Design an enzyme around this catalytic site. Structure first.
Site, PDB file in Angstrom:
ATOM      1  N   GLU A  45       0.828  -1.196   0.000  1.00 16.31           N
ATOM      2  CA  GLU A  45       0.000   0.000   0.000  1.00 16.31           C
ATOM      3  C   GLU A  45       0.871   1.257   0.000  1.00 16.31           C
ATOM      4  O   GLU A  45       0.608   2.208  -0.744  1.00 16.31           O
ATOM      5  CB  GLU A  45      -0.936   0.006   1.208  1.00 16.31           C
ATOM      6  CG  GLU A  45      -1.969   1.114   1.155  1.00 16.31           C
ATOM      7  CD  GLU A  45      -2.214   1.748   2.510  1.00 16.31           C
ATOM      8  OE1 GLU A  45      -1.958   1.076   3.536  1.00 16.31           O
ATOM      9  OE2 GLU A  45      -2.652   2.921   2.549  1.00 16.31           O
ATOM     10  N   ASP A  49       0.994   3.741  -3.188  1.00 16.95           N
ATOM     11  CA  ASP A  49       0.612   5.143  -3.092  1.00 16.95           C
ATOM     12  C   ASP A  49       1.547   6.032  -3.904  1.00 16.95           C
ATOM     13  O   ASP A  49       1.093   6.914  -4.629  1.00 16.95           O
ATOM     14  CB  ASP A  49       0.590   5.599  -1.632  1.00 16.95           C
ATOM     15  CG  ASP A  49       0.480   7.106  -1.494  1.00 16.95           C
ATOM     16  OD1 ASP A  49       1.535   7.775  -1.472  1.00 16.95           O
ATOM     17  OD2 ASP A  49      -0.657   7.619  -1.395  1.00 16.95           O
ATOM     18  N   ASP A 121      -6.965   1.507   0.638  1.00 15.93           N
ATOM     19  CA  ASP A 121      -5.645   0.901   0.819  1.00 15.93           C
ATOM     20  C   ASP A 121      -5.407  -0.299  -0.096  1.00 15.93           C
ATOM     21  O   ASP A 121      -4.315  -0.464  -0.638  1.00 15.93           O
ATOM     22  CB  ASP A 121      -5.441   0.468   2.276  1.00 15.93           C
ATOM     23  CG  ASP A 121      -5.568   1.620   3.260  1.00 15.93           C
ATOM     24  OD1 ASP A 121      -5.540   2.794   2.827  1.00 15.93           O
ATOM     25  OD2 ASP A 121      -5.688   1.346   4.477  1.00 15.93           O
ATOM     26  N   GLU A 124      -4.333   0.741  -3.663  1.00 19.14           N
ATOM     27  CA  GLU A 124      -2.915   1.075  -3.705  1.00 19.14           C
ATOM     28  C   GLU A 124      -2.081  -0.193  -3.583  1.00 19.14           C
ATOM     29  O   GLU A 124      -1.107  -0.378  -4.312  1.00 19.14           O
ATOM     30  CB  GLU A 124      -2.550   2.045  -2.578  1.00 19.14           C
ATOM     31  CG  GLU A 124      -3.268   3.382  -2.632  1.00 19.14           C
ATOM     32  CD  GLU A 124      -2.779   4.354  -1.569  1.00 19.14           C
ATOM     33  OE1 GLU A 124      -2.507   3.913  -0.428  1.00 19.14           O
ATOM     34  OE2 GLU A 124      -2.660   5.559  -1.879  1.00 19.14           O
TER      35      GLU A 124
HETATM   36 MG   LIG Z   1      -2.612   7.318  -0.941  1.00 17.52          MG
HETATM   37 MG   LIG Z   2      -2.597   4.633   1.458  1.00 16.61          MG
HETATM   38 MG   LIG Z   3      -1.245   1.525   5.367  1.00 19.66          MG
END
Ligand SMILES: [Mg+2]
Ligand SMILES: [Mg+2]
Ligand SMILES: [Mg+2]
Ligand SMILES: [Mg+2]
Ligand SMILES: [Mg+2]
Ligand SMILES: [Mg+2]
Ligand SMILES: [Mg+2]
Ligand SMILES: [Mg+2]
Lengths: 261, 109, 110, 261, 109, 110
Positions: A45, A49, A121, A124
RNA sequence: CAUGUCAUGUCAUGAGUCCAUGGCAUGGCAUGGC
RNA sequence: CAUGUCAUGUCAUGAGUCCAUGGCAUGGCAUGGC
């Protein structure tokens, strides 16, 4: 045709990891901290991101070569947000696929009444999964895939958001142009801000007024400076008003007009 | 017809028009200099580089080029115009055909 | 050296004012017919424009609008549309200037 | 050998843009907003920021496969910050090369007494410059270059920062392990936090105490949970103390020891 | 010698040692099952996948494998130990050579 | 099906407790010599350890420490070092088990 | 993007347990970076 | 990462200027996203 075809993760072990929430593994006491970290999706995650923001930035940067940094930033805000990617995640049914230690169902649970950031989450994390599996060739597949997802979001945003309203075709000298035609010192030609931009209402309204209070124009924009310009442009479009005040100035002695009183 | 508001803008526009050409002719070099800069940009200072990506500097150079030669045409008559103009002289004083003035008169009736 | 930076800005501004000036002329100015009417009967026209009619500008604006209603804007047409036709890489003059004289100007400096 | 060789920008027009501050162009009134935006470096800085964070993330993600997201985040904070990249920028003399409309010199100016974020921006802008010039092959040159720059920063950070202190080799069951050996209900064996982590002092200190106030151990860590564990580990290392309390518990009637009083 | 603190840990460790092996032998299948899972992991449930990347499941399988065969060796004697042990019997009861007990006695003098 | 998830966790925990248990034995326990001394003269030893000496564990710990001071830890040595030698891809048993019997076990199930 | 510190709920952990220790979720407060 | 709104300083802009309008820098306050 919609949604866009989801890029596949070849490695089966990795494809499983993106869907493992920390609640599953972190409660297992026989696991070392290291073994835990390699178990759940938190790293994926985190990585996902930065990848998301990276390719989203590149997408809009190229698509909008004349956009400022404030516009590229505001637009990106719509693309990379948890609220946005949560909805994409639900669209792909990441959603139900997620493995937790608790009930995702049962609406009376506090979880359903929250922001469900958990669903953001996993999106990502899926992106991050593609990057660990095959970093080289899954990267362009991420661009081509996120381009397709972004297109409807970009379209709505550039249309209905004030921050993204095109400021070209605007006349930056309009305020001075107006004063040139009509204004003199004793006219007390000025601008008042009736509405300042807020979070609830990101609009600014400014009126162009003369000394006695007569409103020559009104304008609306992302901020006082832009609104004030539109107010000048609003007054400049009315020729009968201008020609009246232009004539009015000529009827004032240069003796009187140069003072403020 | 002929609003006061239109008139104060026209006098300022014509004035600024003439001053602008004079400043260009004075300040700008010809295309030889502009082509020198645009061809090899190394020696050329860093600050002026973005200007070479904009139209203004080239157009300035070309107008000075037209001035170094003959064929300023309209441009010369415009600068000298202020001195040639007289109140009671109703002649157009430009290069336009007097017969074309006749037809436009008839057209606007 | 050549091409001082401070002079570049003055130039760029001047060229911009030049183009903006001509456009506003064409926009606001009527032709020589309308001018000749107003200047001939000044009892009809508004009092405020009388000193303006006695000066060169209005006539000059009317005649430039006249050339515009006709053809033979010549250089003027090229200049207003110049901004469009400009490409970051073009070595050609793009104007009505003979490129042969461009060469004769080259060795003149040398 | 140091600093690392700076990746070159081939395009001369782009190489010039990264060093153009908005104060230079934004005051030129004859320029359209679009022409302004294509003039200064603000877009390049915006793009350069996302690139910076992207490759920095990839660097530390691979170098530290057992790091959590909180550690990868905290570490990245040291690499991508304005304070850090400002110093790299000065190192390459971006610095003086920058074109502004005001005096960068003259220490009595307010500029010198500020955060000089302007010097950070030009570093990002340079990175962004490389990406517009030749996106394909200047990207790996950015990784290889930023790897070299990051190495000393990573070394100091992983050493001297509490957030990055390795939490492995730690015993998560240490607190329970201690209670097993010694603790009983009436012993009132507990943990008190003497120091909570702050921005000024990101350390936590927890003491392991018994009912009468005797301190069996002390510990220090990134937070109360980690400190408390170290306090347990501290008490567990002293055998004479443990054997004393273990014997002490045996001398208490099961009748008495199971109560809290 | 022989602290009380050491003694309560030793009794708990030995106890947990025996229970652990019993639970493994009971719960774990042999390598045939573990090799079935690890070879083609498709049919295998998603939740158990990370376990296959950890040592515990394989070691469990191999110990059950050693149990399906003979050669539990030490492991069997350990479980049965509790029943065989007697207070007044001073015999070691394990597979170790009694002569090696003699030399260790001399060594620690 | 085979390999239930809930059973996997119990197994993984059990294996972990097994290894941790044996290590703590080796660490804390003395050999059979020290045990035999204490159990024979109980007037010297601390009063608290007396009921412990009368139970199987301490003797069992002392004998496992004894096998450790010697060789023939056998399976036990393999098990403690098992965590290290484990590679994500190995199809080999890694223990003292004959791979020939691995085949005879294969068709037995079939 | 993470961190710290609490409240509630819930699931676990441990060997003297009427005790002790944690994971998650939700909601506060605070910190730090872009 | 940007945005909004002010204060000060400084540099510019405009054609009736004892007037009017902006750029930057520094420093507040506030908003929004990661
Ligand atoms: Mg993010
Ligand atoms: Mg995140
Ligand atoms: Mg996290
Ligand atoms: Mg910027
Ligand atoms: Mg940055
Ligand atoms: Mg920046
Ligand atoms: Mg919280
Ligand atoms: Mg500010």
């Amino acid at each position: 045709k919609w949604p866009p075809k989801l890029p596949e993760i070849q490695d089966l072990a990795i494809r499983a990891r993106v869907f493992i929430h920390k609640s599953t593994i972190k409660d297992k006491v026989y696991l070392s901290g290291s073994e835990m970290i390699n178990a759940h999706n938190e790293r994926l995650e985190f990585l996902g991101d930065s990848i998301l923001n990276s390719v989203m930035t590149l997408i809009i940067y190229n698509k909008f070569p004349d956009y400022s940094e404030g516009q590229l930033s505001t637009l990106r805000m719509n693309l990379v947000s948890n609220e946005q990617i949560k909805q994409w995640s639900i669209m792909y049914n990441f959603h139900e696929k997620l493995k937790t230690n608790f009930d995702l169902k049962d609406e009376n649970s506090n979880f359903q009444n929250g922001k469900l950031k958990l669903y953001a989450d996993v999106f990502e994390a899926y992106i991050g999964g593609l990057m660990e599996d095959d970093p080289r060739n899954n990267l362009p597949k991420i661009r081509k895939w996120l381009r397709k997802l972004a297109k409807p979001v970009i379209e709505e945003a550039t249309r209905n958001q004030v921050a993204l309203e095109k400021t070209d075709k605007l006349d930056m000298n309009a305020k001075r142009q107006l004063y040139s035609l009509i204004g003199y010192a004793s006219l007390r030609l000025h601008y008042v801000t009736v509405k300042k931009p807020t979070a609830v209402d990101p609009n600014s309204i400014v009126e162009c007024r003369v000394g006695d209070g007569t409103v020559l124009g009104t304008g609306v924009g992302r901020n006082i400076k832009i609104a004030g310009i539109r107010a000048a442009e609003n007054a400049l479009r009315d020729k009968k008003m201008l020609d009246f005040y232009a004539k009015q100035r000529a009827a004032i002695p240069r003796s009187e007009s140069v003072l403020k009183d | 017809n002929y609003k006061y508001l239109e008139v104060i803008q026209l006098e300022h526009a014509v004035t600024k028009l003439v001053e602008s050409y004079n400043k260009i002719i004075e300040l700008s070099p010809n295309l030889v200099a502009y082509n020198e800069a645009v061809n090899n940009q190394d020696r050329v200072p860093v600050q002026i580089l973005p200007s070479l990506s904009r139209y203004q500097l080239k157009l300035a150079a070309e107008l000075k080029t037209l001035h170094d030669l003959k064929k300023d045409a309209i441009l010369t008559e415009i600068t000298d115009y202020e001195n040639e103009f007289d109140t009671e002289q109703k002649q157009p004083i430009l290069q336009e055909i007097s017969k074309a003035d006749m037809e436009k008169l008839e057209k606007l009736e």
